C-alpha cells in the first residue's frame, strides 16, 4: 500500500527505524554503488540539467532501468539539501 494513510506511513517509518560535483552536490554512497556506469552518467547529466534549470528527455530504451536513475538523482538531491 502507498503512504496515503498517515498511520500506515508512520508504521512503515517505524519498520524502517558520496561523490561530489562542481556546483556542490553529494549523493548517498550506500546507493551509488548499487547502479552501473551508465546510470552514474545519467545522474550527473540530470544534475547538469539542474544547474541550467532546464528539463530533459531520458530516452534509454527499455531494460536499462529508468526508475533508478530518476530515484538516484532524486534521493541524492534530498540528501544534499541544496
Amino acid at each position: 500500500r502507498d503512504d496515503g494513510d498517515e498511520d500506515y506511513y508512520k508504521q512503515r517509518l517505524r519498520r524502517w527505524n558520496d561523490a561530489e560535483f562542481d556546483e556542490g552536490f553529494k549523493v548517498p554512497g550506500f546507493l551509488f554503488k548499487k547502479l552501473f556506469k551508465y546510470q552514474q552518467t545519467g545522474v550527473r547529466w540530470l544534475w547538469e540539467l539542474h544547474c541550467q534549470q532546464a528539463g530533459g528527455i531520458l530516452g534509454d530504451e527499455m531494460g536499462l532501468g529508468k526508475t533508478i536513475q530518476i530515484i538516484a538523482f532524486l534521493a541524492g538531491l534530498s540528501y544534499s539539501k541544496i
Binding site: 544547474c51 541550467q52 534549470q53 532546464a54 528539463g55
Partner: protein
C-alpha cells in the same frame, strides 16, 4: 599634470591614478577632427559602427543604402591630419550585398577574422573578413532591428537577434540552431545586449516598454522585468514610458543603461533590477529604430555618450550630470562608438559622414594667421 608625473615616479600615487586621471581629462577635452578625417563611401546615412575587440584598429560601418565599409583608424603616414581610409567595401557589385538598409554590424569577439551584419532585409549574415564573402545566412520572418554577440562568453557562440516580431530569436554560430526562441514580449524588440559579466545573461528591450533580463540556459521565462517605480512584485512593470530603443551595459556589467522614446534615460542594477534613481535630465529620443550608444571605459568616472538629436550628449554614469554636447553633425545621429585605448569617439549619423571626436589641448608650438578679428577701426 606634472604633479601626477612626479607622484608616479616617487611612488606616492599608484600608477593607475595618473592613467585614469589623464584618461578622463581626454574625454572632457573631446573635440572634432583636429587630426583626422573619415573617408566617405556611404551614399546614404550611416547606421552602425563597431571597433574590433582586440587592438582597436579596424572599424566597420553600415549605411542606409546597404553597403558596409571596413575602415582603418591609425596614421600610417608621417604627417598628421590623416584620412581614415577604407581597406575594403562590400558594395552593390558584391553578389551577397545587403539589398536593403543594414541596421547594425558587429565584430566577432576573440578574433578579427569574422564579423556579422544584420539588415532590414530580414537576414543576419556571417562574413569572412579576409575573403570578404559570407559563410552563414540567417533569414527571418520579420525585419531585424538589432543583434548582439556575447563579448565574454567562451562556452558558446550564440548571437541574439531581435526582430519586428514579439519574440526573441537566438541563433548559434556553432551549428545552425536558429530555432531557440524566447517568449514573454509583446511588440517589436528594438534592442538586445548580452551582459559582459555573465555569459548567459541577456537583456531585451521591446516596444511594450519592458526590458527583460533573460538567462539562455533557463527554460522558464524571464528572470527580472525591470520596473520604473520599484513597486512590490507579467503584463505590467513597464521599464519605460514609451518605446525602449536602447541598451548599453556598463564597463563592469554591474549596471544597465536604457534609452526610450519618453525622452528619459535610466540606470538599472544588473542583479536585482531595481533602478538606481539617476535622473539624467531630458535625453531627446524620437528614433523608431534601434538607438545605439556606448559608455566610456578605463577612466576615473565612467561616461556615457548617447545620441541627442543632431548632437552627442556626455553624462557621468552615476552622478548623472551633463558634461558637454558635441555639436558636429547636421542630421540626427544614431550610433556612437568609443575607442577605449585613445579616448576617442566616432559618430555615425544620417548626413552620410562618420565624425571623429578626438581629445584636444595638445597643439603645435610656433616659433594662428587665420585666428584674428577683422573689425574696422
Amino acid at each position: 599634470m606634472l604633479g601626477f608625473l612626479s607622484a608616479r615616479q616617487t611612488g606616492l600615487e599608484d600608477p593607475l591614478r595618473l592613467r585614469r586621471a589623464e584618461s578622463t581629462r581626454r574625454v572632457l577635452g573631446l573635440e572634432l577632427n583636429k587630426d583626422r578625417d573619415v573617408e566617405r563611401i556611404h551614399g546614404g546615412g550611416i547606421n552602425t559602427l563597431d571597433i574590433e575587440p582586440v587592438e582597436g584598429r579596424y572599424m566597420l560601418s553600415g549605411g542606409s543604402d546597404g553597403v558596409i565599409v571596413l575602415y582603418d583608424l591609425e596614421n600610417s603616414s608621417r604627417q598628421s591630419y590623416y584620412t581614415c581610409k577604407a581597406v575594403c567595401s562590400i558594395g552593390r557589385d558584391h553578389p551577397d550585398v545587403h539589398r536593403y538598409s543594414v541596421e547594425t554590424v558587429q565584430w566577432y569577439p576573440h578574433d578579427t577574422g569574422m564579423f556579422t551584419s544584420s539588415s532590414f532585409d530580414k537576414t543576419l549574415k556571417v562574413w569572412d573578413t579576409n575573403t570578404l564573402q559570407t559563410a552563414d545566412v540567417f533569414n527571418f520572418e520579420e525585419t531585424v532591428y538589432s543583434h548582439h554577440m556575447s563579448p565574454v562568453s567562451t562556452k558558446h557562440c550564440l548571437v541574439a537577434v531581435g526582430t519586428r516580431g514579439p519574440k526573441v530569436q537566438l541563433c548559434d554560430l556553432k551549428s545552425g540552431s536558429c530555432s531557440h526562441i524566447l517568449q514573454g514580449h509583446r511588440q517589436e524588440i528594438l534592442a538586445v545586449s548580452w551582459s559582459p559579466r555573465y555569459d548567459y545573461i541577456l537583456a531585451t528591450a521591446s516596444a511594450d516598454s519592458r526590458v527583460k533580463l533573460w538567462d539562455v540556459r533557463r527554460a522558464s521565462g524571464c528572470l527580472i522585468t525591470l520596473d520604473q517605480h520599484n513597486g512590490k512584485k507579467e503584463s505590467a512593470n513597464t521599464a519605460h514610458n514609451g518605446k525602449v530603443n536602447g541598451l548599453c551595459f556598463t564597463s563592469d556589467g554591474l549596471h544597465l543603461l536604457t534609452v526610450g522614446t519618453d525622452n528619459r534615460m535610466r540606470l538599472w542594477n544588473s542583479s536585482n533590477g531595481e533602478n538606481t534613481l539617476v535622473n539624467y535630465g531630458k535625453v531627446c529620443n524620437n528614433s523608431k529604430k534601434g538607438l545605439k550608444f556606448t559608455v566610456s571605459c578605463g577612466c576615473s568616472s565612467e561616461f556615457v555618450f548617447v545620441p541627442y538629436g543632431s548632437t552627442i550628449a556626455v553624462y557621468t554614469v552615476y552622478s548623472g550630470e551633463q558634461i558637454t554636447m558635441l555639436k558636429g553633425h547636421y542630421k540626427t545621429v544614431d550610433c556612437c562608438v568609443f575607442q577605449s585605448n585613445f579616448q576617442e569617439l566616432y559618430s555615425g549619423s544620417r548626413d552620410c559622414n562618420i565624425l571623429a571626436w578626438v581629445p584636444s589641448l595638445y597643439e603645435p608650438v610656433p616659433d594662428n594667421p587665420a585666428f584674428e578679428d577683422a573689425w574696422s577701426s
